Amino acid sequence: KDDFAKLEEQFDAKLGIFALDTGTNRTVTYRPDERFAFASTIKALTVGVLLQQKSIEDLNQRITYTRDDLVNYNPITEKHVDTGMTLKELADASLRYSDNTAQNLILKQIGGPESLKKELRKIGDEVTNPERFEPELNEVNPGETQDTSTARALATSLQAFALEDKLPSEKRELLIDWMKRNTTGDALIRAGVPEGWEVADKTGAGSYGTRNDIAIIWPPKGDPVVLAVLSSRDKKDAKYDDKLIAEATKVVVKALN
Numbered sequence: 710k711d712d713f714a715k716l717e718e719q720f721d722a723k724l725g726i727f728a729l730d731t732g733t734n735r736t737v738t739y740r741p742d743e744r745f746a747f748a749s750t751i752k753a754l755t756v757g758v759l760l761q762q763k764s765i766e767d768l769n770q771r772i773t774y775t776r777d778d779l780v781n782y783n784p785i786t787e788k789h790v791d792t793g794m795t796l797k798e799l800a801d802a803s804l805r806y807s808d809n810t811a812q813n814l815i816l817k818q819i820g821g822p823e824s825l826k827k828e829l830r831k832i833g834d835e836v837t838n839p840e841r842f843e844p845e846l847n848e849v850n851p852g853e854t855q856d857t858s859t860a861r862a863l864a865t866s867l868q869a870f871a872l873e874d875k876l877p878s879e880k881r882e883l884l885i886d887w888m889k890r891n892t893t894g895d896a897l898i899r900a901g902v903p904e905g906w907e908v909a910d911k912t913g914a915g916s917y918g919t920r921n922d923i924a925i926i927w928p929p930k931g932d933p934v935v936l937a938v939l940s941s942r943d944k945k946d947a948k949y950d951d952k953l954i955a956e957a958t959k960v961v962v963k964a965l966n
């Protein structure tokens with residue numbers, strides 16, 4: 710725990726860590742129950758719920774939308790206004806590019822932030838508190854619980870969908886495969902794990918320099934480790950440093966070693 714404290718000093722940030730080795734039940738925790746804006750990490754759990762509700766052929770359904778529907782960060786969706794996108798294509802864009810419009814379109818499909826909350830409550834997550842769409846959800850002020858969760862809750866809900874029986878295996882594999890092919894976390898959890906370790910992650914960035922990564926990680930042999938690494942800073946306009954998360958992950962790996 711002192712190693713984490715020193716990272717908090719080095720990077721002038723608050724750190725939230727929960728890691729579980731599913732083979733041994735050993736954990737690594739640090740402010741595990743402290744709330745942080747979840748930011749785009751919520752995209753992973755939103756797709757988990759979508760997969761609970763949609764069949765695979767349901768995902769071939771084309772969703773149409775307009776220039777008006779576009780928000781601030783639409784790397785994929787802004788390129789397909791004219792033709793629309795399938796739910797499967799939207800899930801891809803949301804998870805692997807962190808496309809905000811894609812998240813919003815998927816979120817509508819599942820009944821909005823309240824339905825997402827109800828669904829998370831049903832799987833035993835009493836902490837995660839979705840209220841808004843992207844990008845407004847990313848802006849959480851100190852003391853607020855709206856659009857927040859904790860390291861422990863995020864890791865546990867991700868584990869529920871990716872590793873447990875909340876999804877049947879083919880849908881688990883689908884979620885895992887998208888997250889394995891995430892494009893946005895090269896400097897985060899992925900930069901903190903030894904060679905030959907496999908990573909399936911979703912990143913997030915929000916106000917107060919919030920910088921998150923949640924993941925399932927697989928050692929060369931043995932069971933997966935579930936990990937959430939969350940962070941925030943004291944100023945609203947603060948910039949984050951990805952190295953904080955990479956270094957935190959290294960501590961986690963060492964501790965489980």
Ligand SMILES: O=C(O)CC(=O)CCO
Binds near residue numbers: 750806893913
């Ligand atoms: O991490 C996120 O989900 C937000 C992004 O802008 C992608 C890279 O930061």
